[PDB]
């Protein structure tokens, strides 16, 4: 395919952080406070939200969904 430029290089600790458009009540899963930004990041596998710069303190993407999955025996 013509997509000979796959920028598959956006993994800090296993989570895929994609740019979102925070326009409402949002909280930084890395700074435990309200994201007053117009852009944030989300892991499609652990459903976190961060200030689009606090991803270098988020745990491995199998140590985030171990707190962000309300359908697991997390006890
Ligand atoms: Zn933050
Ligand atoms: Zn994740």
UniProtKB/Swiss-Prot annotation:
Instruction: Tell me where in or outside the cell this protein is found.
Output: Cytoplasm, Cytoskeleton; Cytoplasm; Cell junction, Tight junction; Golgi apparatus
Specify the inducers.
Answer: Up-regulated by bacterial peptidoglycans stimulation, such as muramyl dipeptide and in biopsies from inflamed mucosal areas of Crohn's disease patients.
Q: Which residues form the signal peptide?
A: none
- The record's account of how the chain is modified after translation: Phosphorylated by AURKA and CDK1 during mitosis, which negatively regulates its activity. Phosphorylation by MAPK1 or MAPK3 increases nucleotide exchange activity. Phosphorylation by PAK4 releases GEF-H1 from the microtubules. Phosphorylated on serine, threonine and tyrosine residues in a RIPK2-dependent manner.
Q: Where are the zinc fingers (Phorbol-ester/DAG-type)?
A: 14-61
> Domain of life of the organism in this record?
Eukaryota
Clinical disorder: Neurodevelopmental disorder with midbrain and hindbrain malformations: An autosomal recessive neurodevelopmental disorder characterized by intellectual disability, speech delay, mild microcephaly, midbrain-hindbrain malformations, and variable dysmorphic features.
User: What is the recorded function of this protein according to its Swiss-Prot or TrEMBL entry?
Assistant: Activates Rho-GTPases by promoting the exchange of GDP for GTP. May be involved in epithelial barrier permeability, cell motility and polarization, dendritic spine morphology, antigen presentation, leukemic cell differentiation, cell cycle regulation, innate immune response, and cancer. Binds Rac-GTPases, but does not seem to promote nucleotide exchange activity toward Rac-GTPases, which was uniquely reported in PubMed:9857026. May stimulate instead the cortical activity of Rac. Inactive toward CDC42, TC10, or Ras-GTPases.
Q: How does it assemble?
A: Found in a complex composed at least of ARHGEF2, NOD2 and RIPK2. Interacts with RIPK2; the interaction mediates tyrosine phosphorylation of RIPK2 by Src kinase CSK. Interacts with RIPK1 and RIPK3. Interacts with the kinases PAK4, AURKA and MAPK1. Interacts with RHOA and RAC1. Interacts with NOD1. Interacts (via the N-terminal zinc finger) with CAPN6 (via domain II). Interacts with DYNLT1.
**What note about domains is in the entry?**
The DH (DBL-homology) domain interacts with and promotes loading of GTP on RhoA. Promotes tyrosine phosphorylation of RIPK2.
Indicate what this protein is called per its UniProt record: Rho guanine nucleotide exchange factor 2
Q: What is the lineage of its organism?
A: Eukaryota, Metazoa, Chordata, Craniata, Vertebrata
As recorded in Swiss-Prot or TrEMBL, the protein's gene is named: ARHGEF2
Whole sequence portion shown: 28 to 100 of 986
């Amino acid at each position: 395919g013509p997509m000979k430029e796959a920028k598959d290089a956006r993994y800090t600790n296993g989570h895929l952080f994609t740019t979102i458009s925070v326009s409402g009540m949002t909280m930084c899963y890395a700074c435990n406070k309200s994201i007053t930004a117009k852009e944030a990041l989300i892991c499609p596998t652990c459903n976190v939200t961060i200030h689009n710069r606090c991803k270098d303190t988020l745990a491995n993407c199998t140590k985030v969904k171990q707190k962000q999955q309300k359908a697991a025996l997390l006890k």
